[PDB]
Amino acid sequence: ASQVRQNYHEDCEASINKQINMELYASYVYLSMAYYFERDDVALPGFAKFFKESSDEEREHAQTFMKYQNKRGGRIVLQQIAAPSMQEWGTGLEALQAALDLEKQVNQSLLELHSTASGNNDPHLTKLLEDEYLEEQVDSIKKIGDMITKLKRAGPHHGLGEYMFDKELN
Amino acid sequence: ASQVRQNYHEDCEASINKQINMELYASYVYLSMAYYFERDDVALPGFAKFFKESSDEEREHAQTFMKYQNKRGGRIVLQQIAAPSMQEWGTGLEALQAALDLEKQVNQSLLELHSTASGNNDPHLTKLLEDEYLEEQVDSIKKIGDMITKLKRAGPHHGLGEYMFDKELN
Amino acid sequence: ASQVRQNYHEDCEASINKQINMELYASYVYLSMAYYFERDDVALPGFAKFFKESSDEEREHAQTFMKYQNKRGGRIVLQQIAAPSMQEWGTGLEALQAALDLEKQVNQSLLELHSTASGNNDPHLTKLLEDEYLEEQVDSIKKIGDMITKLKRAGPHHGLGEYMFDKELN
Amino acid sequence: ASQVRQNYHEDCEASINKQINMELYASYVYLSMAYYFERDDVALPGFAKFFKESSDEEREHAQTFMKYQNKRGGRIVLQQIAAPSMQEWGTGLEALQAALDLEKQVNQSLLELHSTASGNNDPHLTKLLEDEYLEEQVDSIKKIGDMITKLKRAGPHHGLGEYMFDKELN
Amino acid sequence: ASQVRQNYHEDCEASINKQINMELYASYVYLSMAYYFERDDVALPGFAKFFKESSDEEREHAQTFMKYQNKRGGRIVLQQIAAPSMQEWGTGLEALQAALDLEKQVNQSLLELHSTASGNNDPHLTKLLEDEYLEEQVDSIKKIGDMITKLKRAGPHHGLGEYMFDKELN
Amino acid sequence: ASQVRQNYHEDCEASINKQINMELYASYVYLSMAYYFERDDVALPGFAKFFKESSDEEREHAQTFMKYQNKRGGRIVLQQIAAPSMQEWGTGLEALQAALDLEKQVNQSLLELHSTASGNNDPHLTKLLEDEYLEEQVDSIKKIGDMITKLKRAGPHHGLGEYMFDKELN
Ligand SMILES: [Fe+3]
Ligand SMILES: [Fe+3]
Ligand SMILES: [Fe+3]
Ligand SMILES: [Fe+3]
Ligand SMILES: [Fe+3]
Ligand SMILES: [Fe+3]
Ligand code: NI
Ligand code: NI
Ligand code: NI
Ligand code: NI
Ligand code: NI
Ligand code: NI
Q1: Which is it for the CA torsion A85, A91, A96, A101, positive or negative?
Q2: Is C76 on the interface with F (CB under 8 A)?
Q3: Chain-centre distance of CA D164, in angstroms?
Q4: Are F45 and F166 spatial neighbours (Cβ–Cβ below 8 Å)?
Q5: Which of A35, A120, D29, F166 could cross-link with F46 by S-S, CB 3.0 to 4.6 Å?
Q6: Each residue of E76-107: b (16+ CB within 10 Å) or e?
Q7: If you classify domain F1-170 with CATH, what class do you get?
Q8: Residue B162 sits at the chain A interface (C-beta within 8 Å)
Q9: Dist. CA A60–CA A132, nearest whole Å
Q10: DSSP state of E84
Q11: What does the angle CA B114 – CA B117 – CA B121 come to, to the nearest 5 degrees?
């Protein structure tokens, strides 16, 4: 085995490879949304910017797991990245709602990964999950929830409220 | 008695202790409103900021009365701070209207305290009330009244007007 | 329920509301001590400064729990803040000893809150408690213990030692 | 159709969507190589850096095609991104040789895309391909060829030459 | 007992004293290696620098445990520091391999200390171990593993590769 | 023998190895004292700082002998470092008195080492001892003697004098 490996269970190694693919997938979803909002018949530049940043961040999140895998002595196994569920995302509200659901799905996976790490007595992995993923995930979920409420207040259907709220994200 | 006490009536000393508690209570009310507007299902960051500042200022107002008590030779007696009347404050308009009523209630108490001080021929206390409390209270009441009128103009019910007016407070 | 809530148990939500009240209470205790030491017949400006800072910090600690509540989707419930146990705090030594006991009481509550969070498998809450509260609480307790020992060395009864030690806190 | 579309053939629109997927795939290949060279039993930090930059650039290349699609009035269709052909890439020489082949494969696709655009008399698309893709592709191929020759000179098998050549890329 | 002690088990107190001695011992091992590589018949200034820094860091690690002991109310008990196992360390490769084994030995001890702290429900101690020791230990082990692989690539036996690799550490 | 060795007697080589261990031991003694004075029931931060600096300096003194050994062609032999004679050091006065005795013990050893070097006609070693050790040792002894006298004047028993004198060292 790896000269560096120590207290690193095969199940955590495999779950990290699954989380890598999921982070890359979420990055791909947000990339799809980003350029959907730059279509000439959508033209929501604030939403496009918001989702392009989230796409970059999720790709960074994937790479932090890849560095982590190598650091512990695991071996990165990269799978296929699925096409995004949608090709068109509707209104800003509907995209935010899809993002909220995705973020909560990633959070569930991460909490399961923490349970795996905790069950195998790997405090180094639980620390990584708490400090670098679980904290960020809760803040992201709270932020998206705030945005949904703000957009529902401003007027969530294709109108002046959506146009004004989009400026808040620019 | 206190080596410093001079022309300081027991009734003014007691009324100051009552005003201290009332300032601390108003600070607590505004703190409740501040974090109500940061709930994910309210998301009014301008109102939250406005009330968090008012909460800090009312706590400062309480401390200025505590310094004053010590300066005159009175003795600070701290009571229980009551829970805020509400736990949820409705719309921005309703919170402003509750704040307006509270400010006018504090003003009434302060004017009564001035009458107590004037009745006991304490010009040092009347000066404190006029220069540090009564001036600020009238400006606060005028400001909140302005805000209520502006929010009623922009559209006071949970809609685009409330969302736009909230930006004026950010 | 809240669009953001996830893996957030009702018991942790309720314990956070209890800790909020306790942080606000400790803030109130330290505020009482702060202005006790500014009485003209006490005149310990270093102790007053030390306790006024601790009062501000405990109010900040309360607000961090209020932000946390909102972040997780819980609902803040604010109760009555009890009057401080004492209105007069004796010598500097006696105030420090009362502060030490209060800090250890808050620490016990926080460790219980960690046990609640751990029992409900909430690593996000255990992380908050470890990184933002338990670390600060142990440092505060060690610091107060140091101060008590230093004041006992300098001369803890109302004399030159207390006067000189007070300058160390200015 | 799109209010902006003009002289934009359905075949060019479809070929752009195919090139987007291929750019994303090459980005994924280079990402795999990048973290392969950070394995503790490979430890080639110069190669890792070189491939991580190429991974970022190919993702940028994909996005430029996505902006282009939207600019012309086409509609972005995102497919599945295939897993990289390899999970382990051997020596630096073998990775460079795999990169050279991939770059020449992308170049072939781009030249075919130019033939499609030229056959449909779309000078705007031929200009994009010449100015933004074909130029970069030839420079990349020449650079990788230079590197292969340099590494073959320094000593391409796992030895001092590979270790010294890796420093040239750091 | 100590006026500050709270939730601090005698077994954790004793294990900290054992870890202090082990950190001081590792510091001593690295000090031996550092000046071995400055012998006139070894003359590997990069290795000497690398091990002198690790010697300083392990002594700092020991002191952080000594501060921690005092912070929790435990009592520092200092034992004998054993002579390093070797007086001469061979080649750079052999010293790195000895360092790797020592680092993994310290890591095992620290993970056991975490299990002790976790078994006694001391989250403050588990936090210290995760944030200040376990993170650093894994990075150190990964770094040494990288170095071993790099030196095996450059040529690990007393030759040009060892001479060139030594410059990477200067 | 060493290609560099010249006029370097085996007895001086062995005495240097003995002095190395003694410098490391004194460093360990001062480290013990340093963190004794940071105990919550001692709280003498000036003494702690003074002894932590002396601990660092004695470790530097050990390293200068290790560099010297290598410079002359001798071979460093590292022994066991004994536990400090005490685990608790009493008052500041008692620690200073223990330090004074230790410094005079090291001085005696160094003067014996000078006699060894002089007896073997090694002027290079006598120069090192005079310029780098004997000068520093006499200044240290004079300084500690000054401090003892100053602390005896201020009031050496656990009281205001010890508390005030401790500030002189901060
Ligand atoms: Fe993520
Ligand atoms: Fe007020
Ligand atoms: Fe607190
Ligand atoms: Fe490309
Ligand atoms: Fe260490
Ligand atoms: Fe010395
Ligand atoms: Ni709609
Ligand atoms: Ni309404
Ligand atoms: Ni007393
Ligand atoms: Ni080969
Ligand atoms: Ni060999
Ligand atoms: Ni004594």
Answers
A1: negative
A2: no
A3: 26
A4: yes
A5: F166
A6: bbbbebebbeeeebebbbebbbbbbebbbebb
A7: mainly alpha
A8: yes
A9: 11
A10: P
A11: 135
Other Cβ atoms within 10 Å of F135 Cβ, number: 11
The three-class DSSP label of residue D87 is coil
Q: Which residues contact A60 (CB under 8 A, 6 or more apart)?
A: none
The answer to whether A18 and A110 have CB atoms below 8 angstroms apart is no
Chain A contact set for E117 (CB, 8 A): none
The residue behind tokens 């559209």 is B155
Q: Starting from the CA of residue D110, give the closest ligand.
A: 4
Please compute Rg for chain A using Cα positions.
Answer: 18
What are the φ and ψ backbone dihedral angles of F81, each rounded to 5 degrees?
-105, 120
Could you report how far apart the first and last alpha carbons of chain E are, in Å?
50
Contacts of E126 in chain A (CB under 8 A): 123
Q: Measured between CB atoms, does C138 come within 8 Å of chain F? A: no
User: How far, in Å, is the centroid of ligand 9 from the Cα of C155?
Assistant: 10
> Taking phi first (over 0 means left), then psi (-120 to 50 degrees means alpha), and beta for anything else, what does residue E8 get?
beta
Helix, strand, coil share (%) of chain B residues, nearest 5: 75, 0, 25
Separation of alpha carbons C167 and C49, rounded Å: 11
Spatial contact of C102 and B70, defined as CB atoms under 8 Å apart: no
Pull the structure tokens for residue D72.
Answer: 């012309």
Q: Is A166 helix (H, G, I), strand (E, B) or coil?
A: helix
- For C9-151, where are the E strands, in sequence order? none
User: Hey, what amino acid is at D121?
Assistant: N
The count of residues in chain D is: 170
Structure tokens at A10: 């095969």
Residue C84: phi and psi, rounded to 5, are: -60, 145
Question: In angstroms, rounded to a whole number, what is the distance separating the alpha carbons of residues B88 and B32?
Answer: 8
In Å, how far are A27, A85, D132, F96 from A57, measured between CA atoms? 7, 20, 26, 58
CA B17 to chain centre: 15
Mutating which of A93, A138, A153, A170 best tests the B interface, going by the most B Cβ atoms within 10 A?
Answer: A153
* Torsion B35-B37-B38-B41 (CA) sign: positive
Please list every residue in chain D whose beta carbon sits closer than 8 Å to the beta carbon of residue A28: 78, 81
Quote the tokens at residue F73.
């062609």
- The candidate with the shortest Cα–Cα distance to A127, out of A109, A145, A113, is A113
Buried b (16+ CB within 10 A) or exposed e, C84-119: beeeebebbbebbbbbbebbbebbebbbebbebbee
Amino acid at E130: E
Q: What is the 3-state secondary structure (H, E, C) of F73-142?
A: CCCCCCCCECCCCCCCCCCHHHHHHHHHHHHHHHHHHHHHHHHHHHHCCCHHHHHHHHHHHHHHHHHHHH
Which strand (E) or helix (H) includes residue A122? Answer: none
Question: CA F119, CA B168: separation in Å to the nearest integer?
Answer: 89
